Design a protein around this ligand. Structure first.
Ligand SMILES: N[C@@H](Cc1ccc(O)cc1)C(=O)O
Ligand SMILES: N[C@@H](Cc1ccc(O)cc1)C(=O)O
Ligand SMILES: [Fe+2]
Ligand SMILES: [Fe+2]
Ligand code: NI
Ligand code: NI
Ligand code: NI
Ligand code: NI
Ligand code: NI
Lengths: 234, 234
């Protein structure tokens, strides 16, 4: 009954999460896809911190644990997508020449605090978790990720097709490989103690709270940048 | 008490080993041009701004009435203002170069600056579940390693500052002077057995993490031996 409640909590949080104004904007085919991807450079901090979360926090190569070996396999691949981010950054005309300090001031912007610190908050949440509870973190976080990338892949695929270029990050191929030997949701062959159950609730609430804080920063960046667009070239 | 006395002595011990690292003998070597010794200056980017965030977000807690946490909050306020000095001296040193956004991100998230980039993250993980007296120990150790670093860098720093007649703020005596009721002064504090052992864990991890960063700085110099500073005379 416990595990079943948690998987349901994720579904409910996903349903709130997918309705955020940011995603309504990103999905809106009456606005140019070049305007809908004006939030693209905001992902910078998040994408490479996500790589680092997978490489150095999620992964433990020496674990003999059944659950940790499956995590290790999944984090191996999920940590390769940051190159896709830098690919599409270039394609979208956002790999602009600037001073080193302009890039640093951007990454450490007070207006991208939640974006920058999302993976930090996950690593802190995860520090004392047993592998089975790290799976809940990853499933929650990946449920949020599928919503974000299913939305972003809409304008991305529109630009990819129109410019005749292969987008890799804001692209259906990203959503497909991310979704995914065993998948972590399938390890719903697991039942949780009462302790684990209240912890998994805490995890899902925070993961979606922090994910909503990031998306709120994107919505506000968009708002402060409607007077520009991605500049893809044909 | 005599448990605290052991901690303050372990910090002196750890400072004495740390002071001897090859990177510091290099930075102190007046036979090498100060432009060459500050080859490592841009490495600090991946740290100075994380140090600011550590002080704003991780150490500081504005919903606390504890005596100690209130001392912490005061100290963290000033320590969080030095990142702008870092950007000042970046430009003065000629390291505020024009580049692709992606080259700035690949710099910060370089595998060759992993320990530099993660030092403050590691400190936040260590600190997040400590009582304030124990956070005071993290901060005092960190600040002890910090003094060794800025005592060394201020040598080539002040050489360039006088030679070019420009006000250097970060690799500068003024930074070394302002970093120095003070936290050590609450060595009017007695630790339990448990706190004694955790203070030992804290002081060991701070100095190990600080050694790893300095080791990366030394490897950077060796791999970038031509990329000397290029300050301009006033
Ligand atoms: N898929 C993202 C990572 C991610 C995962 C979960 C999220 O909620 C958000 C983003 C990437 O490759 O960068
Ligand atoms: N004084 C440094 C921070 C620092 C502190 C402790 C250290 O060990 C190193 C660096 C700054 O303003 O950025
Ligand atoms: Fe991904
Ligand atoms: Fe400082
Ligand atoms: Ni997977
Ligand atoms: Ni702007
Ligand atoms: Ni102080
Ligand atoms: Ni904890
Ligand atoms: Ni290099």
């Amino acid at each position: 009954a416990g595990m079943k409640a948690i998987l349901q909590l994720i579904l409910e949080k996903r349903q709130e999460f997918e309705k955020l104004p940011c995603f309504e904007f990103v999905r809106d085919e009456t606005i140019s896809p070049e305007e809908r991807l004006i939030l693209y450079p905001c992902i910078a901090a998040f994408a490479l911190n996500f790589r680092d979360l997978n490489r150095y926090d999620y992964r433990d190569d020496n674990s003999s644990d059944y659950y940790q070996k499956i995590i290790n396999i999944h984090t191996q691949e999920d940590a390769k997508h940051w190159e896709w981010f830098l690919n599409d950054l270039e394609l979208l005309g956002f790999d602009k020449t600037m001073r080193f300090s302009e890039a640093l001031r951007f990454v450490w912007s007070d207006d991208l605090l939640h974006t920058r610190r999302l993976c930090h908050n996950i690593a802190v949440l995860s520090h004392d978790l047993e592998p089975v509870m790290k799976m809940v973190v990853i499933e929650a976080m990946e449920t949020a990720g599928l919503v974000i990338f299913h939305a972003l892949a809409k304008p991305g695929e529109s630009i990819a097709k129109a410019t005749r270029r292969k987008y890799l990050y804001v692209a259906d191929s990203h959503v497909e490989v991310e979704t995914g030997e065993n998948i972590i949701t399938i390890l719903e062959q697991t039942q949780l103690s009462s302790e684990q159950e209240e912890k998994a609730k805490e995890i899902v609430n925070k993961v979606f709270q922090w994910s909503t804080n990031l998306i709120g920063e994107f919505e506000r960046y968009v708002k402060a940048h409607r007077s520009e667009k991605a500049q893809p070239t044909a």
